[PDB]
Design a binder for this molecule. Structure first.
Ligand SMILES: [K+]
Ligand SMILES: [K+]
Ligand SMILES: [K+]
Ligand SMILES: [K+]
Ligand SMILES: [K+]
Ligand SMILES: [K+]
Ligand SMILES: [Mg+2]
Ligand SMILES: [Mg+2]
Ligand SMILES: [Mg+2]
Ligand SMILES: [Mg+2]
Ligand SMILES: [Mg+2]
Ligand SMILES: [Mg+2]
Ligand SMILES: [Mg+2]
Ligand SMILES: [Mg+2]
Ligand SMILES: [Mg+2]
Ligand SMILES: [Mg+2]
Ligand SMILES: [Mg+2]
Ligand SMILES: [Mg+2]
Ligand SMILES: [Mg+2]
Ligand SMILES: [Mg+2]
Ligand SMILES: [Mg+2]
Ligand SMILES: [Mg+2]
Ligand SMILES: [Mg+2]
Ligand SMILES: [Mg+2]
Ligand SMILES: [Mg+2]
Ligand SMILES: [Mg+2]
Ligand SMILES: [Mg+2]
Ligand SMILES: [Mg+2]
Ligand SMILES: [Mg+2]
Ligand SMILES: [Mg+2]
Ligand SMILES: [Mg+2]
Ligand SMILES: [Mg+2]
Ligand SMILES: [Mg+2]
Ligand SMILES: [Mg+2]
Ligand SMILES: [Zn+2]
Lengths: 101, 49, 116, 154, 111, 145, 53
RNA sequence: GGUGUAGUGGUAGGAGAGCGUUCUAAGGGCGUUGAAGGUCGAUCGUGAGGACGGCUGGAGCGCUUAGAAGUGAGAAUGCCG
RNA sequence: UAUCCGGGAGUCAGACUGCGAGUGAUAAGAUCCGUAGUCGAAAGGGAAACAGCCCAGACCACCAGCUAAGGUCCCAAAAUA
RNA sequence: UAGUGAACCAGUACCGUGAGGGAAAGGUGAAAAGCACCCCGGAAGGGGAGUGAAAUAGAUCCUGAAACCGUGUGCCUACAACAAGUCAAAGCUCGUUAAUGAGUGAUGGCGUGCCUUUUGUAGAAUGAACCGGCGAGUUACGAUUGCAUGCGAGGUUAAGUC
């Protein structure tokens, strides 16, 4: 079995036992989470949502909040005296799936 | 007061504006004198009236 | 009192030179040729950090179009049938399906071809 | 500066002809010697400022000491001779172990000498009392005579 | 203990020219290397040959190694100081000359 | 991240055949270039040459509409002064139809190492000679495409 | 004329390929065994074609 | 401190907040069990930049607050090497 | 967002496009005004490339989506509609 | 590269007919204890031994950056054009301030350096060979505005004395 859910304004194919990295969820580490947003479920069977599947759900367990590598945004324009520099570490959350329905 | 805890009142003492020390200060590369001209010169400008 | 600046300059330049590793010849050894390339590298990075999305979207779309032609349909009519059938499946996902699970993609194609 | 430096005068080469930058003296700021552009000058940093502010500063410092309980008054400090260990024993009896400023009447020379050499101790004679001295000190040993002298000069 | 070094410092010949000669002996036995340095008409051959002889002699005496199996493991010519001088050219201009030096260094290993 | 990138060498390459008795070379070469790029597959990723092989047949009979047989001129230059050679598509059709189809497809491919390789996967032959019967190729219908 | 551009370490080292020198004609002397240039007197023993010189 | 709304291209230029260097006064603390400096690291901070380790090195240097400036260089057909 | 008071400036070389006029040969990427825009000081997408044209205003991240002008046979995403 | 031009036998060396101009150049080690003796070599210079806490502290002597010159080694490179990077990425090799690891990089997409000055410069307009150091809005006295403090229709001393 596998599934396709919607999270962080995007979508994720996923399976059980696997960990995914998604946008920051507003919940502490080691805690349960559930996605009632599944777009599709598949494997030997296959069922689709319109847009979401009928009352399905996907269960996960948070493992960590973290921050990606610092990306540096150096805006520059030649001969015009001006540059800006920013750093940015975007936060993420890691979640290991535990069940699909 | 304690010498290892000194503080002035707020707004009493201000940080100097150093000039020609990079572009991101804003006062850099021309010193607020702008592009070429008699005002952009050492001892330039004109009389007072 | 006098100020020399022995370490400030050197540290500030070592930073740039560490950023300039992998660059041909002078552009990893000399501060000027490096800095002039570090800034251009950052410009290109900021720009590619946008074009990346365009590129993968383009790629996914070509794949979806291929997998649809192999079922007797095109990208455009496929996606229109999906929007009709209220099927909100990302193109990334749909490309992954076209690659791995051609049967799931075929089911979606049947849905769309019914919607039309 | 460029003027007080031993040299100059000769323009080291022509304005033109050479493929060399325009230079006007061997001792301009951009030379291995070279007069300094502005640099320091002989300069007086001191400044007086209003008497009421000064006297309020003194009062404020002493009142802070009083509020923190960091005054210590005494009746005596009449040393037969200037031994410092006697004064150290006095500090120990009064339970002082920190910095201290010692205000003394104008003439208690033996006590001043006894207190002089100690590192924790500053000494001053009731008219030379200063904000810097007091604030630097954490506690203030003072003779009653000295306190009266302070309260009459102030 | 398997290897021995020899070095000639403040040598009065060119590094770029000595390197042409070292490029022959690097990866060779001392027999072939000495033969090549003898039948090399160049100038650096003599100094490199003296250095190589010195290395082998140090392997003999200071280390008691068996000369009949040795290999020139490393050999290299670092730059050295430059006593620099001045040719007078036409029209009062002086042109510099850099009388260069070389730090020849040979290493000879048991095998 | 996640999306598939065809490992260079792992994609299996099929062999196709295209008869061109009456088709325009441009349209022929368009479907053919799609095939050679490997855009006919979902495995397509633009840096590994996921495409398939193409055999072309009866290229002498490739259709040229209008006056292209006598007015479509192929120019090339020897990069010597005055060394501009012109050839008509009709003569080129009758004599060296391979070169005709090749120029078409080559212009319609990318000008990369990748496209220069993909142009090798093409195999044009006037008539139905078909020396490649050992590769088990499959007929492809240009008319539907 | 004038270079107008400094050459790189790469371009130097690519000129320096064929600047290397070769040494050739070495064989062993049938008398003394040490190596000599072919068609040259052995400088050690002086023999050439088995005759002292 | 939080919620919402709206906004945050930018030269000359104006305004405000800062990082860093040298020194000083005070406080406090770290150094032959190895300071500064040098060098390599896949580290932290929105930025200036800041740490922690490994090797080198061999004696002075940080941290907090405040202050004073010869306070920050990539260009000057710039000077010296 | 306008006004008044006060501190600090910079700017007095402007360019093109569209419309209204002059000079011009109702020629000029010409010149001079008005009017609006853009550039200047503005990245991005299209016009092959292309400051000044068409769409549109970069605070950052996203291997998410909907559109603009412009486009959908291949190069090169999309209809051999 | 500071401070006197000069921390060193400096107004010296050197330049100039002359008046005159005018440099560069500091640091072993606690102590010379400065490498007896042996080997290669003509010697220099190395290699052992030995002094020393330390010799990669041995006269070019503390530290010993960069440019620059080399040696070796993991990956890549001889049908490819590319302001030389960036983004994606196969393969290979290593294993960290252990965290959506490091290095390399076939191949593909996009992309005409930095400054100055310009209506406008990738610019065939200017400057820079590179590295390192030095090198440009300061101070004194006054004026004015704001901020802060003290005092308040009274706020304040200058010189000078102690
Ligand atoms: K100004
Ligand atoms: K500097
Ligand atoms: K605007
Ligand atoms: K590339
Ligand atoms: K004032
Ligand atoms: K006031
Ligand atoms: Mg100040
Ligand atoms: Mg500005
Ligand atoms: Mg600048
Ligand atoms: Mg002007
Ligand atoms: Mg200027
Ligand atoms: Mg002006
Ligand atoms: Mg750029
Ligand atoms: Mg003078
Ligand atoms: Mg001086
Ligand atoms: Mg002469
Ligand atoms: Mg703004
Ligand atoms: Mg904006
Ligand atoms: Mg220091
Ligand atoms: Mg300065
Ligand atoms: Mg420089
Ligand atoms: Mg219009
Ligand atoms: Mg005009
Ligand atoms: Mg107009
Ligand atoms: Mg301008
Ligand atoms: Mg634009
Ligand atoms: Mg421009
Ligand atoms: Mg759409
Ligand atoms: Mg297409
Ligand atoms: Mg070819
Ligand atoms: Mg090849
Ligand atoms: Mg290019
Ligand atoms: Mg140029
Ligand atoms: Mg030049
Ligand atoms: Zn012989």
């Amino acid at each position: 079995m596998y599934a396709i859910i919607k999270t962080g304004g995007k979508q994720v194919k996923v399976e059980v036992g696997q960990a995914i990295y998604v946008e920051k969820l507003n919940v502490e580490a080691g805690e349960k989470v559930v996605f009632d947003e599944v777009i599709l479920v598949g494997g030997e069977s296959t069922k689709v949502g319109a847009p979401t599947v009928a009352g399905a759900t996907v269960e996960g367990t948070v493992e960590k909040h973290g921050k990606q590598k610092k990306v540096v945004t150096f805006q520059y324009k030649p001969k015009k005296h001006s540059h800006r520099k920013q750093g940015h570490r975007q936060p993420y959350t890691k979640v290991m799936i535990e069940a699909i329905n | 007061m304690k010498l290892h805890e000194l503080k002035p009142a707020e707004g009493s003492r201000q940080v100097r504006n150093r000039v020609g020390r990079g572009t991101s200060s804003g006062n850099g590369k021309t010193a607020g004198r702008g592009q070429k001209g008699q005002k952009a010169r050492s001892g330039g400008g004109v009389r007072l009236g | 009192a006098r100020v020399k600046g022995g370490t400030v300059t050197r540290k500030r330049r070592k930073k740039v030179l560490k950023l300039a590793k992998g660059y041909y010849g002078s552009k990893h050894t000399l501060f000027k040729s490096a800095k002039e390339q570090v800034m251009n590298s950052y410009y290109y990075a900021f720009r590619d950090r946008r074009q990346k999305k365009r590129d993968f979207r383009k790629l996914w779309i070509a794949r979806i179009n291929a997998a649809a032609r192999m079922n007797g349909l095109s990208y455009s009519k496929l996606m229109h049938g999906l929007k009709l059938a209220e099927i909100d499946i990302n193109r990334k996902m749909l490309a992954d399906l076209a690659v791995n699970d051609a049967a799931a993609f075929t089911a979606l194609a049947e849905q769309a071809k019914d919607a039309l | 500066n460029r003027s007080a430096v031993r040299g100059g005068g000769r323009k080291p080469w022509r304005q033109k002809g050479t493929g060399r930058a325009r230079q006007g003296s061997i001792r301009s700021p951009q030379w291995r010697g070279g007069g300094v552009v502005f640099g320091p000058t002989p300069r007086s940093y001191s400044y007086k400022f209003p008497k009421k502010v000064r006297r309020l500063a003194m009062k404020s410092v002493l009142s802070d000491k009083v509020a923190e309980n960091n005054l210590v008054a005494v009746e005596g400090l009449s040393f037969d001779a200037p031994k410092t260990k006697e004064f150290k024993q006095v500090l120990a009896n009064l339970s002082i172990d920190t910095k201290v400023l010692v205000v003394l009447e104008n003439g208690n020379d033996f006590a001043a000498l006894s207190a002089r050499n100690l590192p924790n101790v500053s000494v001053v004679t009731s008219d030379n009392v200063s904000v810097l001295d007091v604030v630097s000190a954490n506690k203030v040993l003072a003779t009653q005579t000295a306190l009266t002298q302070i309260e009459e000069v102030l | 203990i398997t290897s021995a070094k020899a070095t000639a410092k403040t040598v009065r010949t060119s590094p770029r020219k000595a390197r042409l000669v070292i490029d022959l002996i690097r990866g060779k036995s001392v027999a072939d290397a000495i033969s090549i340095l003898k039948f090399t008409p160049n100038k650096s051959a003599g100094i490199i040959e003296k250095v190589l002889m010195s290395a082998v002699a140090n392997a003999e005496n200071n280390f008691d190694l068996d000369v009949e199996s040795l290999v020139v493991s490393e050999a290299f010519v670092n730059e050295g100081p430059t006593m620099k001088r001045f040719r007078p050219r036409a029209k009062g201009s002086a042109s510099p000359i850099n009388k260069r030096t070389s730090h020849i260094t040979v290493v000879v290993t048991e095998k | 991240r996640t999306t598939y990138m065809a490992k260079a060498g792992e994609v299996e390459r099929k062999w196709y055949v295209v008869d061109a008795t009456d088709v325009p070379l441009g349209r022929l070469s368009a479907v053919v270039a799609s095939v050679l790029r490997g855009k006919n597959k979902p495995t397509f990723t633009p840096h590994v040459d996921t495409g398939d092989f193409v055999i072309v047949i009866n290229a002498d009979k490739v259709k040229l509409t209008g006056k292209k047989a006598t007015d479509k001129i192929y120019y090339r230059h020897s990069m010597y002064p005055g060394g501009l050679k012109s050839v008509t598509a009709g003569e080129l059709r009758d004599k060296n139809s391979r070169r005709l189809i090749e120029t078409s497809v080559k212009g319609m491919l990318p000008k990369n190492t990748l496209g220069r390789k993909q142009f090798t996967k093409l195999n044009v032959y006037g008539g139905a000679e078909h020396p490649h019967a050992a590769q088990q190729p499959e007929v492809l219908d240009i008319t539907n495409l | 004329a004038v270079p107008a551009r400094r050459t790189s370490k790469a371009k130097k080292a690519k000129r320096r390929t064929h600047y290397k020198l070769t040494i050739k004609g070495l064989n062993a002397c049938s008398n003394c065994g040490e190596m000599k240039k072919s068609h040259h007197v052995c400088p050690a023993c002086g023999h050439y074609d088995g005759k002292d010189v």
